[PDB]
C-alpha cells in the first residue's frame, strides 16, 4: 500500500497512523546513540505558513536558459512560523511519556 | 533597519553573462540570509558571495 516519500527530519509529516496505540521502536534501547522512533495513534495537526507575499522574478543567463530569483516583497514582511495546538501536543507528549515508562 | 527589530531578508545585485557573451549586464535580486556568506579577507562587509 502506498507510502509517502516526504522528506522531513524531526517530525514525520503526512504519515500513516498506528492502528491501536502509540508504539516505540529501537534496535536496542540500551544504546543511547541509536535512533528511537515513536509512532502516534492520534494525529497532531501542524500548520505552517510564510505570509510574506514573495514575488517571482526571471533573470536570464547566457543563451536561452532562465534563472529565477525573489523580487520585491509586496506587503509588510512577517516571520515564517509553524503552529501546533497546545492541548493536543501536551496530551500526546504525555502519552508518549507513559509509553517510554513501559520500557523505563 | 533598526538593528534587527525586523524579520530581515537581504537584497543584493550582481553582474550576469547576458545573452551576448562579452557584454555583461547588471541585475538585482534578493536572497534569504543562510545563502549568503562574507567574502572579504578583511572585516569588510561590502562584498558577498553565495554560500556555494
Amino acid at each position, epitope marked *: 500500500h502506498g507510502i509517502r516519500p516526504v522528506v522531513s527530519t524531526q517530525l514525520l509529516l503526512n504519515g500513516s497512523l498506528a492502528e491501536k496505540e502509540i508504539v516505540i521502536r529501537s534496535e536496542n534501547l540500551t544504546n543511547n546513540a541509536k535512533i528511537i522512533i515513536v509512532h502516534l495513534h492520534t494525529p497532531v495537526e501542524i500548520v505552517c505558513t510564510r505570509p510574506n507575499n514573495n514575488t517571482r522574478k526571471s533573470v536570464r543567463i547566457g543563451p536561452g536558459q532562465t534563472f529565477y530569483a525573489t523580487g520585491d516583497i509586496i506587503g509588510d514582511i512577517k516571520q515564517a512560523h509553524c503552529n501546533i495546538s497546545e492541548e493536543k501536543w501536551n496530551d500526546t507528549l504525555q502519552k508518549v511519556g507513559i509509553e517510554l515508562q513501559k520500557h523505563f | 533597519v*533598526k538593528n534587527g*527589530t525586523v524579520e530581515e531578508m537581504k537584497n543584493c545585485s550582481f553582474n550576469t553573462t547576458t545573452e551576448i557573451r562579452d557584454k555583461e549586464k547588471k541585475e538585482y535580486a534578493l536572497f534569504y540570509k543562510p545563502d549568503i556568506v562574507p567574502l572579504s579577507e578583511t572585516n569588510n562587509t561590502s562584498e558577498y558571495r553565495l554560500i556555494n
Partner: antibody
Amino acid sequence: EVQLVESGPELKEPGASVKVSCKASGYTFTDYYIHWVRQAPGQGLEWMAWINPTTGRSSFARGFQGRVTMTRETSVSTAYMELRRLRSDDTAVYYCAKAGYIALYVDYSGYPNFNSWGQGTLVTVS
Amino acid sequence: QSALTQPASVSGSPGQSITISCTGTSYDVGSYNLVSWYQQHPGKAPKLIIYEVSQWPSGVSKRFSGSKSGNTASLTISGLQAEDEAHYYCCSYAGSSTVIFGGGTSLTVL
C-alpha cells in the same frame, strides 16, 4: 484618551513638498499602523499609503509613484509623510488614522479598517 | 474615479430601509472579504462603520448591517431616521497591498 494631532493648514506653490505631520496619543504608537487618506474639498476619499511605525517599510498608491517620502519617529510618537511634485489638482484635505494591529505573524498591512482619525489638515496650491 | 463604484445618491422617506451598493471586480472584492464603510457629516473627518464585511465596531446598533456577494457589497441603512443624512463611503482591500475607496454617496433629504 486617543487623539491624533496634525500640523496646521498650509499654502504652497506647484511642484512643492508638503510636510504633513501626524502625532499620536492615548495608545502604544508602536502597536498600530498609522494610515493616510486624502479628500479633496467637498469630494470623496483617496487612499495614500502605509507605514510600519516600528520597521519603517512602506508602500503607497500607484497614482503617486513619482515621488513620496515617509518617516517614523519612535521616541516622539509621531509620523511624517511628504507629497512631492505637487500639482494644482493635489490640493485637498489630508488625514492620518490608526489602522489594524501590527501582528507579529500575520500581514495586517492591508486591512482597511481604521477606527480613529486625526482632525484633518489641508494644503492650498496657488 | 477609481474602479470601486458606488451610486451617486439614494433617497427615501423616514422609516424606510435602503441598500447602498458597492461594486468592484473579481480581482479585488470578488476574491477578498475585507470590506468596510465610512460615514461623514460635512466639515469633519469620517467615522468607521463595519470594520470587517459584517462585524460591528461600537454602539452603532443593527441599523447598518452589511453584505457581500461576488464583486458586489451593500450597506443596509435600515430603520431610516432623517438625522442620518450624511455621506457614506465604500472601501475594500485591493491588489499590491493597496486600498481603494468607493465613489461615495448622498443620503435622503426627504
